[PDB]
Design a protein around this nucleic acid. Structure first.
Ligand SMILES: Nc1ncnc2c1ncn2[C@@H]1O[C@H](COP(=O)(O)CP(=O)(O)OP(=O)(O)O)[C@@H](O)[C@H]1O
Ligand SMILES: [Mg+2]
Ligand SMILES: [Zn+2]
Ligand SMILES: [Zn+2]
Ligand SMILES: [Zn+2]
Lengths: 51, 49, 66, 263, 61, 144, 97, 44, 45, 48
RNA sequence: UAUCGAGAGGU
């Protein structure tokens, strides 16, 4: 298991820690239920990829 | 830098219409009128002013 | 965000009618009739209640920060 | 020569016909009631605690809009004309509000009825937040959740709507004249037939329609002005109309004084 | 000057009852930074109360 | 993202020609199209050597050179302003110093409120960054 | 800056000489520059977000060039087509009919 | 049976967004990268 | 010295600038300044 | 406008705009003018 | 009170 690097996770994807939780715990994580993801967080900044 | 350049004593803001201004007037916000200036030479006729 | 105190256009107080308006809708009244019962006669005043969105209910879900 | 006919009346609105006056006088009365009849309203908010989700000035703006009992406000002074430092008991009413939500569940709705008068120019009837009934909670101000608190001290002052619309005792003022357009002051837009396409005045039955032969009376002037004065409860509708007349008088009186002093 | 940056209450004028801070007190005419709207106003020093150990004290602080 | 305005399409006083518009001042007084505005300022301490790090503090004039021209009197001892305090342009909201290489030993690195802005301090975050040095955000609120 | 000071007023793009004309200052409250509606045409200005630029002459000689050569009334007729570049517009033109 | 109405068409469209939302072309694309593409790229 | 509040558990506490930046109660390293001692006034307009 | 400029010079011609504006804008303030959806509607015969 | 870039915008 040698570590080769870190990959930024797209929010609300299957590999995001937010995909489960459900509105109750979304509010506890300070996350807005209207926020549908599809972007990354890099040094605190929300980055979206343009097709 | 030579055929054109940035200059002092300049200003810029949003424009509005005024039915109660003469054709050759421009209404200037007070804050702009207090930042800009004109160097008037002091003579006997304007020293009090 | 929360029901406005006054109608923007005429000034009539509408901030005391939000609970009564929601109650009339639970009782099965249609929106137009509920507004009629509340004596909201001018359409400026009707717009205030009919199109308000109560966002403060959303903001309250965020566990207080003190 | 001025004539008045009260069509209907209740606490917060008076419907009436005004006649044998000039259009300009009916209109100046309309404007005065909207803009210059004093009332009392919160104008300074001391926030000692606000842990609600609403911003301090968001709440302060709503507070200013809460209608307060202004019946005796004419005997009350303006802050800018009072000899005291800061505010005081002769030129302001002090109200206080304190809300809190105890319990780990539910929401506490804070209403204008929780505003408690603390001082004021006794024993003048000024400063109580207007109520519809006795069971009336009044105007919704804020909402609180577990541990959220609101603790404010409000200074209410005499003012007029020229300064801020919160001091207006009215809401709308309905106002019209010549319901059959005999004066020809408006020229109606139409597709096919102007009479069928434009609705009737609610005072159409108060004047008689023009006869099909009738020639145009080019000397007639507007003379009957139907108006309805609604209020917010800070003043009763009859009070607004009466004080409107009074206020317009003092304004003309002050002009007359200044002319008789320029001599 | 000993009253710069110190909190102030206004006792005369159109701004009576409002909080502020002495931003500049060159002489006689002070500049108070009002709290309530985002504006710094010109006001005479006679019009101000300054906060001190006991309550709001006129310009004897 | 908007409001239902009561709109007249009319020539009134000529103050709405060529795509301007007349707005009701009383509606504005009652809250029409009023909005909150928020700006956050971020700063963090930087490391320049083994024991040479920047420091959040209220810098004393005797020991620090090139102080900003704005007021430092709204800063607390932690170098940060507190929520509830009114701020104007060029007021210092984050006090920070940098040491001078080899009394009077530090250099000012403070953050003033943007000169064209004003408002009230809304919230102040204090934390550490990935490298362990201090990290702050100051949010200012005003109403437009 | 004070009332009746001459200043050079300008909207980009500066396509021709009446894109830069000298106006008389009137100091006013609120934060916009105010224009008489009849000068919108040579500036191609309107009020949907347009901004305009103002320049202040710094001497007796440059003030006089503005007031005696560039002033708005001197510019009413343009050499481009031997005809005016300003007229009655919008409310005033609708209303005068 | 009967005819499919306009309201039924909006019933279908609601079902689309109920399943897919508005950003599913972003999320599904990234999910395939984590599930498979990294592994396949290493084995290239 | 200066009052703070933990961004996670809402505990209130003070720090004398030299203390490490964390909450004494839960050890959270994201904290927020408590409100000013100063009085706040608004014009309710 | 062209004629007043040639006949009276730039000062008078500049006042002309203000004079015309102040009379007409007053009259129009008290006469009114609008436009609505109705002004796009031709009658049923013309549509046919 | 930095420099070099990039991106999004205003008329
Ligand atoms: N990209 C650009 N480059 C240069 N000038 C531009 C520009 N975009 C806009 N402008 C300037 O702004 C003008 C555009 O005005 P607009 O407000 O965009 C359209 P209009 O033709 O005045 O009105 P309309 O909206 O009634 O069609 C141009 O004529 C030019 O003066
Ligand atoms: Mg434009
Ligand atoms: Zn209304
Ligand atoms: Zn008093
Ligand atoms: Zn904690």
């Amino acid at each position: 298991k040698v570590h080769i690097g870190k990959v930024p996770i797209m929010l609300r994807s299957k590999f995001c820690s937010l995909r489960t939780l459900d509105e109750v715990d979304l509010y506890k994580m300070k996350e807005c239920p209207y926020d549908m993801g599809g972007y990354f967080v890099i040094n605190g900044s929300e980055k979206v990829l343009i097709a | 830098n030579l055929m054109g350049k940035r200059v002092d004593f300049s200003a810029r803001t949003v424009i509005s219409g005024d039915p109660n201004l003469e054709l050759d007037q421009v209404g200037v916000p007070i804050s702009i009128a207090k930042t800009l200036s004109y160097p008037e030479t002091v003579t006997q006729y304007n020293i009090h002013r | 965000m929360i029901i406005p105190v006054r109608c923007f256009s005429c000034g009539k107080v509408v901030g005391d009618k939000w609970d009564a308006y929601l109650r009339l809708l639970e009782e099965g009244k249609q929106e137009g009739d509920a507004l009629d019962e509340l004596k909201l006669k001018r359409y400026c005043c009707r717009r205030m209640v009919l199109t308000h969105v109560d966002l403060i209910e959303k903001f309250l879900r965020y566990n207080p920060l003190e | 020569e001025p004539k008045v006919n009260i069509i209907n009346a209740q606490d917060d609105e008076v419907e009436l016909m005004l006649s044998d006056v000039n259009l300009s006088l009916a209109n100046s009365l309309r404007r005065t009631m909207l803009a210059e009849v004093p009332t009392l309203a919160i104008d300074l908010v001391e926030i000692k605690m606000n842990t609600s989700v609403l911003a301090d000035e968001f709440i302060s703006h709503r507070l200013g809009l809460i209608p307060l009992v202004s019946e005796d406000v004419e005997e009350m002074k303006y802050s800018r004309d009072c000899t005291c430092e800061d505010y005081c008991d002769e030129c302001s009413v002090v109200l206080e509000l304190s809300a809190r939500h105890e319990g780990e569940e539910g929401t506490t709705d804070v209403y204008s009825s929780s505003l408690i008068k603390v001082s004021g120019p006794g024993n003048l009837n000024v400063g109580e937040p207007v109520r519809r009934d006795d069971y009336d909670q009044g105007i919704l101000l804020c909402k609180l959740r577990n541990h959220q608190e609101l603790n404010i001290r409000c200074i209410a002052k005499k003012g007029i709507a020229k300064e801020h619309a919160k001091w207006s005792p009215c809401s709308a003022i309905a106002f019209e004249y010549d319901p059959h357009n005999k004066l020809k002051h408006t020229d109606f837009w139409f597709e096919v037939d102007a009479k069928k396409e434009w609705p009737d005045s609610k005072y159409a039955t108060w004047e008689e329609p023009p006869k099909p032969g009738e020639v145009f009376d080019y000397k007639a002037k507007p003379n009957r002005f139907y108006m309805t004065v609604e209020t917010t409860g800070s003043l009763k509708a009859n009070q607004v109309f009466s004080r409107g007349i009074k206020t317009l008088q003092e304004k003309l009186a002050n002009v007359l004084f200044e002319l008789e002093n320029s001599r | 000057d000993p009253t710069l940056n110190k909190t102030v209450k206004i006792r005369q004028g159109g701004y009576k009852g409002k909080i502020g801070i002495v931003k500049e007190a060159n002489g006689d005419r002070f500049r108070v930074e009002l709290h309530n709207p985002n504006k710094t106003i010109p006001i005479p020093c006679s019009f101000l109360l300054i906060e001190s150990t006991h309550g709001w004290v006129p310009y004897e602080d | 993202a908007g409001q239902n305005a009561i709109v007249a399409i009319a020539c009134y006083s000529g103050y709405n020609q060529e795509d301007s518009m007349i707005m009701n001042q009383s509606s504005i007084d009652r809250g029409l199209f009023r909005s909150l505005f928020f700006r956050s300022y971020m700063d963090q301490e930087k490391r320049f050597g083994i024991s040479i790090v920047e420091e959040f503090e209220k810098p004393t004039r005797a020991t620090t050179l090139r102080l900003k021209h704005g007021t430092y009197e709204k800063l607390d001892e932690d170098g940060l302003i507190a929520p509830g305090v009114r701020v104007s342009g060029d007021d210092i909201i984050i006090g920070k110093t940098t040491p001078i290489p080899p009394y009077h030993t530090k250099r000012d690195a403070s953050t003033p409120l943007r000169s064209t802005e004003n408002g009230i301090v809304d919230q102040v975050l204090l934390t550490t960054n990935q490298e362990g040095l201090k990290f702050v955000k100051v949010r200012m609120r005003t109403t437009k | 800056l004070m009332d009746d000071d001459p200043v050079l007023f300008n909207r980009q793009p500066s396509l021709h000489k009446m894109s830069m004309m000298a106006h008389r200052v009137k100091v006013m409250p609120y934060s916009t520059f105010r224009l008489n509606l009849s000068v919108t045409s040579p500036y191609n200005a309107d009020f949907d977000g347009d901004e305009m630029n103002l320049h202040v002459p710094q001497s007796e000689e440059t003030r006089a060039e503005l007031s005696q050569l560039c002033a708005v009334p001197l510019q009413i007729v343009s050499p481009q087509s031997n005809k005016p570049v300003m007229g009655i517009v919008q409310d005033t033109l609708c209303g005068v009919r | 049976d009967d005819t499919i109405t306009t309201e039924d068409c909006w019933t279908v469209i609601s079902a689309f967004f109920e399943e897919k939302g508005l950003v599913s072309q972003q999320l599904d694309s990234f999910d395939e990268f984590m599930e498979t593409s990294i592994q396949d790229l290493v084995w290239e | 010295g200066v009052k703070y509040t933990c961004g996670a558990c809402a505990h209130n506490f003070s720090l004398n600038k030299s203390d490490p930046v964390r909450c004494k109660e839960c050890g959270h390293r994201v904290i927020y300044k408590a409100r000013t001692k100063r009085m706040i006034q608004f014009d309710a307009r | 406008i062209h004629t007043v400029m040639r006949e009276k010079g730039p000062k008078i011609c500049a006042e002309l705009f203000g004079n015309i504006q102040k009379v007409v804008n007053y009259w129009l303030l008290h006469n009114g003018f609008s436009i609505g959806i109705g002004d796009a509607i031709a009658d049923a015969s013309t549509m046919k």
